């Protein structure tokens, strides 16, 4: 089975930049997607196709992918960005076909 | 706008059965794959099954294979998930998602339903 | 000749699973590039469509509801097997250029099927396998595997069926079982799909085009900085319209023309009109007509 590793916690001060790393073996060869989930909500697609944004996501969010690491970078962090961020890929192996990561909780300091 | 909106009960005894229903309004829904993704309380997301735009070629995850049955009624713009032989490991919040092709990225999701 | 990208109907040349090329394929017009349709205009390649250039393509037909899509619209070349398409795909010899993730065609059932790879994988030069892409950018479209054209039609063809002299198997279809020593070869066979018919392979391809003054027989353009312009905005003679238009003799025979105040100019598209095909002596109005290279086995009698 193909697993995606994700650091459980990320602290960042407001105005600074936050970075979340999705770790998978040879992940540079797959399309990486990033969803954001707030408590009491459903996950919302913030990044798809390794670097692109659906309409509605500000230009603060940027995706990248290379080798064994794909990074979601949130510039100009706001207090409203406190949430769980999950990465997701397609993998036609071992029955899951849609591998979500362990998830990263971003908490904003100075608050 | 697109608004995948869910229903369905979610409190049952082990070995029981339930039925989730995700109604679609805002896209065609006849051209998009439909998947079910669950989330255990506090844990992350697990994909469960997907059904094709036409109704044939359904796939499940081995965790759930044999127990649940995903169906769709394109006429009434709906997407059903029948759960049978439930047990505590399934207790989670279940969401419907649309992908628009088998390899894609699960654009808008349902609101969620607890089990 | 100069209006090959002014498309009949809506002009959509994308496959449903692939969206990011909608800014230039949805629709196709004088400007922009489209990897799903541009490849159709390299001369010598796709001669049958280049003959009837002002008739719809396959993706163009499915987005005008003429041709239906199949269950799973894309078959995987990485799954357990991905069987639904492979049986039909192997019998046809095709050649996919690099960087293509998807390739579509008319299946034997009359719907638009496609064979597609997982993200950042490409189709091999025979379109039968997927391999990790060798470049950095994949094409954002689907490569047509058939020289083909389509049109709207209500002519029922459920009584029709493939009949070919001395043929045992043509592609997927098994016309009969043969005992004789067989000759097997890849042949460019013609075919056509009708309202309630499957893919009907043919010995001869006899087509006839009846020209008319219907909307899809014209091409309108306004302000090379040309862009397409919907003919439905031009008022007919003794009618109402939102714009003003001029045209050639054919256009002004039906719609009202003003040489000074016209937003656009409309010509009569050459080679446009209702196309009919002769199947076993009977003339019918097909939904699509095309060629494809498939394995034909023939008896020796």
**So where are chain B's domains?**
1-115
Query: Do β-strands B5-7 and A104-108 pair in parallel, antiparallel, or remain unpaired?
Result: unpaired
- Distance of alpha carbon C252 from alpha carbon C236, whole angstroms: 9
C286: in domain:
no
User: How near does any CA of chain A get to the CA of B94, in Å?
Assistant: 10
User: How near does any CA of chain B get to the CA of C75, in Å?
Assistant: 9
**Are C55 and C151 a contacting pair, CB within 8 Å?**
yes
Element at C249 (helix H, strand E)? helix C249-254
Phi, psi for A74 (deg, rounded to 5): -110, 105
Number of structural domains chain A divides into: 1
Neighbours of B39 (CB within 10 A): 22
A57 touches chain B (CB under 8 A): no
Neighbours of A19 (CB within 10 A): 15
* Domain hosting residue A66, numbered range: 1-111
- Distance of alpha carbon C147 from alpha carbon B61, whole angstroms: 40
| CA triple C22-A27-B62, angle to 5 deg | 90
If DSSP codes are grouped into helix, strand and coil, which group holds residue A46? Answer: strand
Neighbours of A51 (CB within 10 A): 14
Q: At which residue do the structure tokens 């970075």 appear? A: A19
Both tokens assigned to C268: 């009569």
A2 touches chain B (CB under 8 A): no
Number of structural domains chain C divides into: 2
What Å resolution does this PDB entry report? Answer: 3.2
CB pair distance less than 8 Å for C17 and B54: no
Q: Give the largest Cα separation in chain C, rounded.
A: 73
Residues C144 and C240 in one domain: no
Residues of B in contact with C74 (CB under 8 A): 101-102
User: How near does any CA of chain C get to the CA of B99, in Å?
Assistant: 9
Phi, psi for B88 (deg, rounded to 5): -60, -30
| CA triple B34-B35-B39, angle to 5 deg | 150
| Residues paired with residue C218 on neighbouring β-strands, in sequence order | C268
Residues C140 and C245 in one domain: no
Query: Among candidates C31, C174, C145, which has minimal Cα distance to C85?
Result: C145
- Distance of alpha carbon B62 from alpha carbon C221, whole angstroms: 57
Query: Among candidates C71, C57, C124, which has minimal Cα distance to C97?
Result: C124
Euclidean distance between the first and the last CA atom of chain A, given in angstroms as a whole number: 40
Residues of B in contact with A95 (CB under 8 A): 60-63, 65
C160: in domain:
no
Residues of A in contact with B70 (CB under 8 A): none
B12 touches chain C (CB under 8 A): no
DSSP C161-189: ----TTEEEETTEE-----SPPEEEEEEE
Residues C42 and C140 in one domain: yes
Contacts of A61 (CB under 8 A, 6+ apart): A34, A46, A47, A53, A72, A73, A74, A75
Neighbours of chain C (3+ CB pairs under 8 A): A, B
Using CB atoms and an 8 Å cut-off, which of residues 69-108 of chain B contact chain A? 95, 103-108
- Distance of alpha carbon C151 from alpha carbon C67, whole angstroms: 9
Q: At which residue do the structure tokens 């073996």 appear? A: A25
Option in B47, B65, B110 nearest A97 (CB): B47
Q: Let me know how long chain B is.
A: 115
Experimental method: X-ray
B61 touches chain A (CB under 8 A): yes
DSSP C47: H
**Are C123 and C117 a contacting pair, CB within 8 Å?**
yes
User: How near does any CA of chain A get to the CA of B16, in Å?
Assistant: 25
- Distance of alpha carbon C104 from alpha carbon C146, whole angstroms: 8
Q: Is the peptide bond before A44 cis (omega within 30 degrees of 0)?
A: no
Q: At which residue do the structure tokens 């044999």 appear? A: B66
If DSSP codes are grouped into helix, strand and coil, which group holds residue A103? Answer: coil
Query: C9 — alpha (psi -120 to 50), left (phi > 0) or beta?
Result: left
**Are C272 and C165 a contacting pair, CB within 8 Å?**
no
**Are B53 and B37 a contacting pair, CB within 8 Å?**
no
**Are C117 and C79 a contacting pair, CB within 8 Å?**
no
- Distance of alpha carbon B53 from alpha carbon B69, whole angstroms: 16
Element at C276 (helix H, strand E)? strand C274-279
* Domain hosting residue C229, numbered range: 215-268
**Are A92 and C79 a contacting pair, CB within 8 Å?**
yes
Both tokens assigned to C153: 């039609």
| Residues paired with residue C258 on neighbouring β-strands, in sequence order | none
If DSSP codes are grouped into helix, strand and coil, which group holds residue C131? Answer: strand
Question: What sign for the dihedral angle of Cα B61, B65, B67, B73?
Answer: positive
DSSP chain B: ----EEE------TT-EEEEEEE--SS-SSSS-EEEEEE-TTS-EEEEEEE-TTS-S-EE-TTTTTT-EEEEETTTTEEEEEEES--GGG-SEEEEEE-SSTTS--EEE---EE-
Q: What's the burial of C45, exposed, middle or buried (CB within 10 Å: 0-12/13-18/19+)?
A: exposed
**Are A88 and A35 a contacting pair, CB within 8 Å?**
yes
Using CB atoms and an 8 Å cut-off, which of residues 245-284 of chain C contact chain B? none
Residues C139 and C29 in one domain: yes
- Distance of alpha carbon A51 from alpha carbon B63, whole angstroms: 32
- Distance of alpha carbon B53 from alpha carbon B24, whole angstroms: 13
Q: How far is CA B49 from the centre of its chain?
A: 7
Helix then strand count (H, E) for chain C reads 5, 19
């Amino acid at each position: 089975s193909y697993e995606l590793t994700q650091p459980p916690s990320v602290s960042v001060a407001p105005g600074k930049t936050a970075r979340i790393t999705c770790g998978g073996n040879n992940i540079g060869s797959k399309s990486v997607h990033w969803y954001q989930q707030k408590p009491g909500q459903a996950p919302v697609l913030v990044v798809y196709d390794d670097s692109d944004r659906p309409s509605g996501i500000p230009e603060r969010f940027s995706g990248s992918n290379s080798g064994n690491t794909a990074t979601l970078t949130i510039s100009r962090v706001e207090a409203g960005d406190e949430a769980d961020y999950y990465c997701q890929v397609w993998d036609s192996s071992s029955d899951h076909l849609y591998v979500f990561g362990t998830g990263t909780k971003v908490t904003v300091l100075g608050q | 706008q697109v608004q995948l909106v869910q229903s369905g009960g979610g409190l049952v005894k082990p070995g029981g059965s339930l039925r989730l229903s995700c109604a679609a309004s805002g896209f065609t829904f006849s051209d998009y794959y439909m998947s079910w993704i669950r989330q255990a309380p506090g844990k992350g997301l697990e994909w469960v099954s997907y059904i094709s735009p036409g109704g044939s070629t359904i796939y499940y995850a081995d965790s759930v294979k044999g127990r649940f049955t995903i169906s769709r009624d394109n006429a009434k713009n709906s997407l059903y998930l029948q759960m049978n032989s439930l047990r505590a490991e399934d207790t989670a919040v279940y969401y419907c998602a649309s992908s628009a092709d088998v390899y894609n990225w699960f654009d808008p999701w349902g609101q969620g339903t607890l089990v | 000749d100069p209006h090959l990208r002014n498309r009949p109907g809506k002009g959509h040349n994308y496959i449903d699973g692939m969206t990011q090329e909608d800014a230039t394929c949805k629709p196709v017009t004088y400007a922009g590039a489209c990897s799903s349709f541009d490849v159709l205009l390299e001369k010598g390649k796709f001669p049958l469509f280049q003959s009837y250039a002002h008739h719809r393509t396959l993706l163009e037909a499915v987005h005008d509801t003429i041709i239906a899509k199949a269950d799973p619209p894309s078959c995987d070349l990485q799954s357990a097997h991905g069987n639904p398409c492979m049986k039909e795909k192997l019998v046809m010899k095709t050649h996919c250029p690099n960087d293509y993730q998807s390739a579509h065609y008319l299946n034997n059932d009359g719907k638009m099927a496609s064979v597609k790879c997982p993200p950042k994988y490409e189709l091999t030069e025979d379109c039968n396998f997927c391999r990790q892409m060798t470049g950095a950018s994949l094409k954002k479209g689907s490569y047509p595997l058939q020289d083909l054209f389509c049109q709207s039609s209500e002519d029922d063809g459920s009584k029709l069926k493939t009949k070919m002299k001395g043929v045992c198997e043509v592609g997927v279809q098994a016309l009969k079982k043969c005992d004789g020593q067989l000759s097997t070869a890849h042949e460019v066979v013609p075919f056509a799909v009708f309202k309630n018919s499957k893919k009907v392979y043919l010995d001869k391809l006899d087509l006839k085009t009846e020209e008319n003054l219907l909307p899809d027989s014209f091409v309108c353009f306004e302000h090379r900085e040309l862009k397409s312009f919907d003919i439905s905005q031009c008022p007919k003679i003794g009618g109402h319209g939102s714009k003003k238009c001029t045209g050639d003799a054919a256009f002004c025979s039906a719609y009202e023309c003003t040489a000074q105040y016209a937003n656009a100019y409309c010509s009569h598209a050459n080679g446009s009109g209702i196309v009919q095909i002769q199947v076993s002596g009977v003339w019918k109005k097909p939904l699509c007509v095309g060629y494809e290279r498939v394995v034909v086995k023939r008896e020796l009698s």
